[PDB]
Ligand binder design. Structure first.
Ligand SMILES: [Cl-]
Ligand SMILES: [Cl-]
Length: 162
């Protein structure tokens, strides 16, 4: 199991524009298109991204191309973030994939505000960090996905995912 397979499970795969859990236009493998309410704005953002007139539909190939770019952006975003980097560098391979999942779903930004968890993670206080991670909107809104990532941090295994 790896990051791609892991996010591919958490996000699903859709080829038609859709509303995510928050009602934002999304497509592919968790690719947020826009925060706005206009489907037009969504379509326009889609076409700009894909580089053709999609008419709100893409193929698998294109979903997968967005997915690659998004994972890559996430890694590079952690690495460039002063608060995340050190976190990421201290972790083992499984756990980094968990931090990358979070960053993917919520932005470097949303992630860096879990300071307390972050610091616990850096100290290797697994059970405590897991408890802290659970006191968040993130968990209350998407509890099953949050639990998988959380076990992941806690155990440093892929069990949540098998
Ligand atoms: Cl893009
Ligand atoms: Cl969920």
């Amino acid at each position: 199991m790896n990051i791609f397979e892991m996010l591919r499970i958490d996000e699903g795969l859709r080829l038609k524009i859709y509303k995510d859990t928050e009602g934002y236009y999304t497509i592919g493998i968790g690719h947020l298109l826009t925060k706005s309410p206009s489907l037009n704005a969504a379509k326009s953002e889609l076409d700009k991204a894909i580089g053709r007139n999609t008419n709100g539909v893409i193929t698998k190939d294109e979903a997968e191309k967005l997915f690659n770019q998004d994972v890559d952006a996430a890694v590079r975003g952690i690495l460039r973030n002063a608060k995340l980097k050190p976190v990421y560098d201290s972790l083992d391979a499984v756990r980094r994939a968990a931090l990358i999942n979070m960053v993917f779903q919520m932005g470097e930004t949303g992630v860096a505000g879990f300071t307390n968890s972050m610091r616990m993670m850096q100290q290797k206080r697994w059970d405590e960090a897991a408890v802290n991670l659970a006191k968040s909107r993130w968990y209350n809104q998407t509890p099953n996905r949050a639990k998988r990532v959380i076990t992941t941090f806690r155990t440093g295994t892929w069990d949540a995912y098998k």
